[PDB]
Write a protein that binds this ligand. Sequence first.
Ligand SMILES: Nc1ncnc2c1ncn2[C@@H]1O[C@H](COP(=O)(O)OP(=O)(O)O)[C@@H](O)[C@H]1O
Ligand SMILES: [Mg+2]
Lengths: 464, 75, 45
Amino acid sequence: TAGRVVRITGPVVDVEFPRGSVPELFNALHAEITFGALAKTLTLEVAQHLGDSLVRCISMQPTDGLVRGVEVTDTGASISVPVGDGVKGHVFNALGDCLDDPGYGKDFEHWSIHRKPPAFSDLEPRTEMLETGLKVVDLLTPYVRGGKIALFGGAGVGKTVLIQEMINRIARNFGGTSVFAGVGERTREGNDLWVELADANVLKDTALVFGQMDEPPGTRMRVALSALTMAEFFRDEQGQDVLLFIDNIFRFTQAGSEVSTLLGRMPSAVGYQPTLADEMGELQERITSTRGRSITSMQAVYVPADDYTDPAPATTFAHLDATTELSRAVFSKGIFPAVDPLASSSTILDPAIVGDEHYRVAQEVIRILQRYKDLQDIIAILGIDELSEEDKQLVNRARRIERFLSQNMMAAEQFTGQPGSTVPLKETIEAFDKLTKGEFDHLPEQAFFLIGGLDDLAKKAESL
Amino acid sequence: XXXXXXXXXXXEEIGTVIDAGDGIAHVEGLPSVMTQELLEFPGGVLGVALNLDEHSVGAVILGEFEKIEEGQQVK
Amino acid sequence: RFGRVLDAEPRLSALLSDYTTPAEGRVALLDKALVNQTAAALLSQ
Ligand SMILES: Nc1ncnc2c1ncn2[C@@H]1O[C@H](COP(=O)(O)OP(=O)(O)O)[C@@H](O)[C@H]1O
Ligand SMILES: [Mg+2]
């Protein structure tokens, strides 16, 4: 005995079941579409109970071709993804289907994507700094080994460049095992990544799960859970340390809104779903470094219309330990990676963790840039000349500090042709201390763009 | 015994427009219509069956929706 | 007894839902499938 479809509205499908055989929430159901070249087996996920033995489900595939009255069979379990050391090296989708080898993973151990987060008693905060080799990050927003990092920004400001750069900075040398969740990003980038990780030979040590934009919202929101399951398996069972890249996690909340509008739930503010914070929290709290093991996560967050006050970014800000924030304005200045020094933040930027020499320089730089950002309102009208000398001396080196935060990243080599640069922390501290104290105030601003370290600064200045 | 009784009890479709407004229509009948099926109306007008409810089908009208009216046959 | 049957048999119970279908055929099927003459008379009523 099994159920029947009785309503269809986009990817959302209502199914009626016998009186006593209603499926539990988040159970997976199978249905058939038999029109033609469009035919396929649909997986539906139970999202609600509507009463009278009727339940409302989210389709993981496009419903096109689904006719009313077709039978629907309950699997009795949630959507299950393959887990195991054999997962590494291959590409998967949200439903556990391998794309590189269709039959792969059918015989592996299967874990449910829906799981409760770790007990509070097993949580412990991390403080060990992670050295990436980017000046602005390592100085003002030091990442945490085993913490949660995020890259915010609008459209067309450097999510992908900086994300693959950080892949080169961490994953290229990380001794552990990596997972890459592509949540609603463009597919061409996924193919580029699948090729690049093989060129660099890193592929054999990382797993990829993709849910790109073309897919309907129902799976577009579950892809994150699908990959997080493999990440937390590598965490809890194998005991390895893990890197969990996710791009872009805003599309998870966007798919949540799309499915919400169909489920019939009333809209919140500007038009997101209610429980937005609850879904995002249920997702993010699972990505945590429990005692004795670690899962380092770098997330990308989209920001529509550059409205940093949009409820979704404003919500996701709460779950992150490090938050690099890109900006349109800094990008227009030609600065790259275009990080906003005053908006970005990191919780471990305190003297007890990073040391006094680092903290003092970071805070002096922040003070200089803040005074600059306050004088901008006059700078824009009357130019620098109107300012008093205590302000003009400050602005002259503020511009230089700002431009020196730029760096010639390895990823940009494919566009600019200039090779990449990695700098150690101590050299960055020395350089910015010298800058704030004025040992380089005599050089022109254009000398500072996209340098790298200090020796490269001298080499470039000599040529001008 | 129950199965045979159920089978004994169980032992070209055309619908009708019940509601029409501003480029959208609702259609009765068509139990076997597929979602996003290209329906056709008497006036030489097509439609896309977006929503399939328990009692009626929601169809966005393509082209001249002026030619649609209540009581028209849809196939 | 009839209630016990109709509760234990969920598919038969769903088939017994007939206010949308033609009531004459529903009555015919129920009578053919389903004794105390008065109880079955009330059931058909
Ligand atoms: N240091 C740099 N120099 C020159 N161009 C850059 C640099 N960093 C990023 N870019 C440009 O910015 C673009 C980033 O786009 P992307 O981050 O994918 O936007 P989104 O993620 O919003 O689609 C790239 O196409 C790249 O050409
Ligand atoms: Mg990108």
